[PDB]
Design a protein around this ligand. Structure first.
Ligand code: 8M6
Length: 110
């Protein structure tokens, strides 16, 4: 039985993957495939890749100790996007919008 706080995190994760946010969540569904995207410097710049499917697997495997560890992975995902891509890139605009959704509901932690 997940703790109350980790149940809240699982709900956040379900919302982030839902159709309601799919227009800006889609770049974060799967690990960045640097070779497929021609981003041949991605893994020289990003040392710890993260994506929503990895967060989902770690939640299902009970990897996360607490809500703080879950939130660190979600924020690592956004930070990687801000680090690698130029600030005017469309994916950065999508990252900002998905992070806005995350931060406001994470703040409602019970
Ligand atoms: C999280 C993060 O930092 N990422 C780096 C940047 C990026 C992605 S996913 C993605 N899709 C596209 S286009 C459709 C696509 O390529 N799909 C695809 C194809 C082959 C293999 N895997 C996929 C998903 N473009 C180009 C573009 C310019 C404006 C919006 O999108 C991207 O820059 C990215 C992840």
């Amino acid at each position: 039985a997940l703790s109350e706080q980790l149940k809240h995190c699982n709900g956040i994760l379900k919302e982030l993957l839902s159709k309601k946010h799919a227009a800006y969540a889609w770049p974060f569904y799967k690990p960045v495939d640097a070779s497929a995207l021609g981003l041949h410097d991605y893994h020289d710049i990003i040392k710890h890749p993260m994506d929503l499917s990895t967060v989902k697997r770690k939640m299902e495997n009970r990897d996360y100790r607490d809500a703080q560890e879950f939130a660190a992975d979600v924020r690592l995902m956004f930070s990687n996007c801000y680090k690698y891509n130029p600030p005017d890139h469309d994916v950065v605009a999508m990252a900002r919008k998905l992070q806005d959704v995350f931060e406001f509901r994470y703040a409602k932690m019970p």
